[PDB]
Design a protein around this motif. Structure first.
Motif, PDB file in Angstrom:
ATOM      1  N   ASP A 115       1.756   1.513  -3.618  1.00 55.62           N
ATOM      2  CA  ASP A 115       0.550   1.934  -4.356  1.00 55.62           C
ATOM      3  C   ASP A 115       0.239   3.433  -4.164  1.00 55.62           C
ATOM      4  O   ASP A 115      -0.171   4.102  -5.099  1.00 55.62           O
ATOM      5  N   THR A 123       8.439  -2.302 -10.251  1.00 55.70           N
ATOM      6  CA  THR A 123       8.301  -1.167  -9.375  1.00 55.70           C
ATOM      7  C   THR A 123       9.556  -0.306  -9.318  1.00 55.70           C
ATOM      8  O   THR A 123       9.503   0.867  -9.662  1.00 55.70           O
ATOM      9  N   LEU A 163       4.096   6.127  -4.579  1.00 54.21           N
ATOM     10  CA  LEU A 163       4.795   6.191  -5.856  1.00 54.21           C
ATOM     11  C   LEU A 163       3.799   6.516  -6.959  1.00 54.21           C
ATOM     12  O   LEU A 163       3.491   5.650  -7.739  1.00 54.21           O
ATOM     13  N   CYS A 219      10.431   3.085 -11.738  1.00 61.21           N
ATOM     14  CA  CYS A 219      10.473   4.434 -11.174  1.00 61.21           C
ATOM     15  C   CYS A 219      11.854   5.081 -11.364  1.00 61.21           C
ATOM     16  O   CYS A 219      12.074   6.204 -10.935  1.00 61.21           O
ATOM     17  N   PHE A 274       7.058   8.462 -11.588  1.00 57.59           N
ATOM     18  CA  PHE A 274       7.139   8.201 -13.003  1.00 57.59           C
ATOM     19  C   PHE A 274       6.181   9.122 -13.704  1.00 57.59           C
ATOM     20  O   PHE A 274       5.311   9.716 -13.091  1.00 57.59           O
ATOM     21  N   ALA A 284      -3.021  -3.422  -2.840  1.00 63.08           N
ATOM     22  CA  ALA A 284      -2.743  -3.752  -1.427  1.00 63.08           C
ATOM     23  C   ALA A 284      -3.938  -4.341  -0.651  1.00 63.08           C
ATOM     24  O   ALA A 284      -3.762  -5.180   0.243  1.00 63.08           O
ATOM     25  N   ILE A 285      -5.151  -3.867  -0.937  1.00 62.84           N
ATOM     26  CA  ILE A 285      -6.320  -4.409  -0.249  1.00 62.84           C
ATOM     27  C   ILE A 285      -6.528  -5.881  -0.509  1.00 62.84           C
ATOM     28  O   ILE A 285      -6.879  -6.644   0.398  1.00 62.84           O
ATOM     29  N   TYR A 299      -1.584  -3.604 -10.091  1.00 58.65           N
ATOM     30  CA  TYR A 299      -0.939  -2.487  -9.423  1.00 58.65           C
ATOM     31  C   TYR A 299       0.501  -2.904  -9.161  1.00 58.65           C
ATOM     32  O   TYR A 299       0.738  -3.820  -8.375  1.00 58.65           O
ATOM     33  N   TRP A 300       1.455  -2.229  -9.791  1.00 60.47           N
ATOM     34  CA  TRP A 300       2.861  -2.581  -9.596  1.00 60.47           C
ATOM     35  C   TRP A 300       3.169  -4.072  -9.855  1.00 60.47           C
ATOM     36  O   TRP A 300       3.863  -4.720  -9.078  1.00 60.47           O
ATOM     37  N   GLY A 344       0.810  -1.211   0.000  1.00 62.13           N
ATOM     38  CA  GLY A 344       0.000   0.000   0.000  1.00 62.13           C
ATOM     39  C   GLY A 344       0.849   1.267   0.000  1.00 62.13           C
ATOM     40  O   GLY A 344       0.461   2.265  -0.577  1.00 62.13           O
TER      41      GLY A 344
END
Ligand SMILES: Cc1cc2nc3c(=O)[nH]c(=O)nc-3n(C[C@H](O)[C@H](O)[C@H](O)COP(=O)(O)OP(=O)(O)OC[C@H]3O[C@@H](n4cnc5c(N)ncnc54)[C@H](O)[C@@H]3O)c2cc1C
Ligand SMILES: Cc1cc2nc3c(=O)[nH]c(=O)nc-3n(C[C@H](O)[C@H](O)[C@H](O)COP(=O)(O)OP(=O)(O)OC[C@H]3O[C@@H](n4cnc5c(N)ncnc54)[C@H](O)[C@@H]3O)c2cc1C
Ligand SMILES: NC(=O)c1cc(N2CC2)c([N+](=O)[O-])cc1[N+](=O)[O-]
Ligand SMILES: NC(=O)c1cc(N2CC2)c([N+](=O)[O-])cc1[N+](=O)[O-]
Ligand SMILES: [Zn+2]
Ligand SMILES: [Zn+2]
Lengths: 227, 229
Positions: free
Chosen positions: A117, A174, A120, A178, A126, B109-110, B103-104, A114
């Motif tokens: 998420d 990730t 970043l 970035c 980015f 995350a959830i 996501y990434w 998180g």
């Protein structure tokens, strides 16, 4: 002269093995003369969920909510929630970012996911149009991870596969994305199973490595390297 | 009499993910399946793995260890009720679908926290009792993922590398580990970029595949499948 390090730390228990690796990193970098900052995510009760609460004041589009777009606009207009912007200020300043975490499901704990998420975001880490054009270029990053599984389990022909396989989303998807230069990860295998001599060994190997991290070359963060 | 659980992770019901979720509910429902959705953001699902997940005495209050304490709490029936609510949904399901934006190169995350807190030792796996002897053996799982990157970006020599590379921690490290048979993922590439007709095409391709998922065989969830060495 004058290096700044951010440790993003994701463990519930200060007396844990992760806690010891964190404290050794603080002590060693501090002894070297580095400026050090720790984000202890559990202690801050860091919010992991990506929601509209991350944007202060009016939304870009209230009718239909798009987190990527709305955080990008909020970043540009300086209206992200202060917990996000406090973390971004820490990252902006750091020359090196160390992430210290136990491996949860071949990845980071949700609280740390998180942080990635929410912190970043586009405009900050980015833009579209990443990787080598990525906005955090010039910064080093280094994953320090502990596992439940032994080193033997994390080989090409072991049950879990090569540990480089689970690193790809974090290192490439990730960190590289970035613009970070990624140092080789520190993996401490199966500390809960290890002897007290072994645990001391792994802790000392970590502090020994920190003594010379400024001289390390980044890894080639490529498919070839991971696979 | 098949039971399906959709674990859904998107903030916005009008989104593309919301559309894929809705057609899954509609299509499975139309076939006569029993359907449950866990809409994580709507439930405000707690992602953090903390000591609040255990009620009653910790096994070792002096040094807290999440894996040990949740294993014991499972056996003692003292896990927080939001964890136990989800475990009952999984226990009953023949098929678990995860529907989420990438996501990434991973789950939001959830959804990561749903995996971290719901799939505990004693419930999803034991030591020993994992991969092909995982405790959820006999259950199917399917990832339905949306991306910002296009299909071209997710190839071997693309900027992102092959899409299968990012699936490893979820398909193998998590789902296979827990004993699930994994069906081939549904990837809907770059819907924000796509035309109106192409988005419709992607929705209809998902609907169409669901009509026949009970006939599908699992993938060989191996290093070679994911990585082609
Ligand atoms: C939800 C979840 C998912 C997981 N998924 C995975 C996975 O996919 N793959 C995997 O391999 N593992 C997985 N694990 C296992 C996890 O990665 C390990 O439990 C964790 O890494 C162990 O690290 P720790 O810091 O928690 O160790 P701790 O248990 O806190 O410490 C180990 C021992 O070291 C001792 N210690 C502390 N400091 C020192 C020191 N200074 N010197 C000597 N000893 C010290 C402690 O007293 C303790 O007995 C998962 C665990 C959970 C809870
Ligand atoms: C923190 C973060 C990290 C990310 N990391 C990655 C990453 O690593 N890799 C990557 O590739 N991407 C990444 N992304 C992008 C992300 O995966 C996409 O934004 C997401 O997949 C898009 O899906 P959506 O449901 O949100 O689309 P939407 O925002 O809803 O947009 C798609 C369009 O489809 C329309 N639509 C909805 N329903 C229908 C329907 N019934 N029929 C026709 N059209 C319809 C909508 O109106 C909309 O215009 C990241 C995004 C964020 C915010
Ligand atoms: N001991 C292990 O090998 C182990 C232990 C755990 N749990 C017990 C801590 C998990 N896991 O929770 O995913 C995974 C593994 N693993 O090798 O993939
Ligand atoms: N469209 C893309 O190419 C894209 C977009 C985003 N964000 C804008 C949605 C992210 N990402 O958030 O890391 C990643 C990628 N990617 O392909 O690795
Ligand atoms: Zn890379
Ligand atoms: Zn597998």
């Amino acid at each position: 002269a004058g290096k700044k390090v951010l440790i993003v730390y994701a463990h519930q228990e200060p007396k844990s093995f992760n806690g010891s690796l964190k404290n050794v990193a603080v002590d060693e970098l501090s002894r070297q003369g580095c400026t050090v900052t720790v984000s202890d995510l559990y202690a801050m009760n860091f919010e992991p969920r990506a929601t509209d609460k991350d944007i202060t004041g009016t939304l870009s589009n209230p009718e239909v909510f798009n987190y990527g777009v709305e955080t990008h606009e909020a970043y540009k207009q300086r209206s992200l929630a202060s917990d996000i912007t406090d973390e971004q200020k820490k990252v902006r300043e750091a020359d090196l970012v160390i992430f210290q975490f136990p491996l949860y499901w071949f990845s980071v704990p949700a609280i740390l996911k998180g942080w990635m998420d929410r912190v970043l975001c586009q405009g900050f880490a980015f833009d579209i149009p990443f990787y080598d054009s990525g906005l955090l270029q010039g910064k080093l990053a280094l994953l320090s991870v502990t596992t439940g599984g032994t080193a033997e389990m994390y080989t090409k022909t072991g049950v879990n596969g090569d540990s480089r396989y689970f690193l790809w989303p974090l290192q490439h998807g990730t960190l590289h994305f970035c613009g970070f230069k990624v140092l080789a990860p520190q993996i401490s295998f199966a500390p809960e199973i290890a002897s007290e001599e072994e645990r001391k060994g792994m802790v000392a190997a970590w502090s020994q490595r920190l003594q010379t991290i400024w001289k390390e070359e980044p890894i080639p963060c490529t498919a070839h390297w991971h696979f």
